[PDB]
Structure formats: C-alpha cells, structure tokens
C-alpha cells in the first residue's frame, strides 16, 4: 500500500513529499514523530527506497556543506514552512556577493535538496535582528550586559537570579532561537552567587578586598 | 629602602598577601600607609612605624 496508510491513524502529522532522485521523503515536524516514522523503515514493511527529513536536522546537514564550499558566509537560518520552497535568510551588512554568484549559489543548493522545487534567497537586515532581541529582553525586566564586537553581539545574564525570571528568560531565548537561530547572537545564562561572599571590597581602579578585620588582600583591580 | 624598618607589635598583628613591586618605595610606602592606616617616620638612621 501507500506510505500514508503505513503510518499512524492520524493522517495529519506527516507530509510525504516525492523527491527528484526517485526517492520518497517524509517530512516530520518534531523529534518525537521522527522516531515514529523511523520505526516504520526499521521494521522493514516497505520494499522501495525512502527517507525521513526534518527541519533542525536538515539545517545542520547542509550547513556542513556550507562550511567547506562557502566559508565566510553570513547567513541566519533556513525556514521550511513549505519544503518545496525553503527561505534562506542571508545577511545584508556583511556581504558583497552580486546576483550572478547568488544564482550559482541557488543552483548548488538546489542540487543538495532533490525534493525542493526552487529555493528563494532573501536578504534580512542585521540591526533589526538585535533590536528585537534587545526590545524583548527589556520587556521581561531582565538584568543584562551587552557586549558589542565585530560580527555578533553577546548578552551576559549573571548574578543570583530567582525562580520566576529563570522561566521567563528561558521561554524567550528558546523562542528567539526557534525563529532566528543561534549563529550570530548568543545568549549566556549563568546563575552564580555573590562574589566576595561576606567580604568588604573597595571598587574602582585601585582595589583591595578585606578577608578579615586584620587582613587585606590585593588581587586584580575590582 | 636603604634603612632598617621597626614596626611596633600592635601593628604586627595585621596581615597581608599579594604581589608587590618596589622600585621607588618612598612613594609606595606613603600610599599604602593611608590605605592600611599607619604612621611612619624616618629619623636618618632608621624608619619607625606605628599604627
């Protein structure tokens, strides 16, 4: 029979797409339903050839190809809301490629995905990917420290945070990572206690820490 | 410093640790005597130090 009947009763969670190299690709949408389909190909109730694709798995397979055939490329993410036409979020402020070498990039990427009909490459801005992350980190009233440097920013959330801001920060970073990917802007959640625990120090350009009523320590300038 | 240093025994109970560097110690002694809290005096043969 057909593959759509070989899967579960709900014929809505899988999407079977026909490939161009006489293969038959199955498109799941999370990791739990991928092993559901991988069990089908493992018990062996299908004679022909088939494969199971994903979105996060498919994005780290043609990023290995993009590591050796196109180094120094500033991209963001490949979106698979329609797997016959993926969207390629390419950077705007850090490239110099024209349309012709963008065309030969779409052809070698078309030959990597035999199931897609045409890949669309759209250039996204780079200062709006961080202005929405900065605006989203201020909405939750979270302490942070921005560190601007060339080719990516970094937000450092240190200090002893409590339990209602751990859930509220983790629900925003994992939903920012879902749509933008973690290759340009990196979130560093780090829960640590009070440095210089019950100690009295003297900050700024000539620093010393007092470990006792009669003991002065002179480490690096606090 | 080319002179001996005599610190009294009430100011010898405090402690210190670190990496210090002496090349002009007459300015370095003056700055650390306000941070530690100390008084000193050089009479021409020795340097007396109190708390």
């Amino acid at each position: 029979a057909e593959l759509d009947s070989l899967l579960g009763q709900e014929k809505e969670r899988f999407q079977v797409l026909p490939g161009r190299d006489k293969m038959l690709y199955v498109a799941a949408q999370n990791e739990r339903d991928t092993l559901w389909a991988r069990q089908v190909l493992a018990r062996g109730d299908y004679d022909k050839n088939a494969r199971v694709i994903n979105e996060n798995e498919e994005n780290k397979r043609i990023s290995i190809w993009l590591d050796t055939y196109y180094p120094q490329l500033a991209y963001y993410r490949i979106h698979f809301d329609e797997p016959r036409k993926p969207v390629f979020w390419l950077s705007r402020q850090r490239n110099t490629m024209s349309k012709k070498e963008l065309e030969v990039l779409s052809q070698k990427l078309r030959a990597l995905m035999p199931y897609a009909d045409s890949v669309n490459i759209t250039l996204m801005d780079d200062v709006t990917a961080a202005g929405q992350a900065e605006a989203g980190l201020k909405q939750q009233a979270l302490p942070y420290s921005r560190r601007n440097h060339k080719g990516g920013v970094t937000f450092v959330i240190q200090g002893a945070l409590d339990d209602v801001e751990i859930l509220r920060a983790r629900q925003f970073v994992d939903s920012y990572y879902r749509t933008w990917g973690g290759r340009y802007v990196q979130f560093a959640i780090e829960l640590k206690d009070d440095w210089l625990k019950g100690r009295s120090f003297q900050y700024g350009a000539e620093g010393y820490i007092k470990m006792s009523p009669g003991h002065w320590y002179f480490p690096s300038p606090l | 410093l080319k002179e001996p240093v005599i610190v009294s025994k009430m100011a010898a109970r405090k402690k210190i640790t670190g990496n210090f560097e002496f090349h002009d110690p007459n300015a370095l002694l003056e700055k650390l005597s306000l941070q530690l809290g100390l008084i000193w005096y050089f009479d021409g043969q020795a340097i007396y130090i109190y708390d």
Partner: peptide, 21 residues
C-alpha cells in the same frame, strides 16, 4: 568611579576606607 561596598563592617574599617580621600 571609586567607592566602598560595606557588608556589616565595624566602624574601624569604615573610617579607614575614607582615610584615602
């Protein structure tokens, strides 16, 4: 700028911290 973060000091170590300015 400069300053002092005192956590339960004992009024000897406070006025000694002001003994530099």
């Amino acid at each position: 700028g400069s300053g002092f973060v005192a956590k339960d000091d004992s009024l000897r170590t406070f006025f000694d911290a002001m003994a530099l300015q």
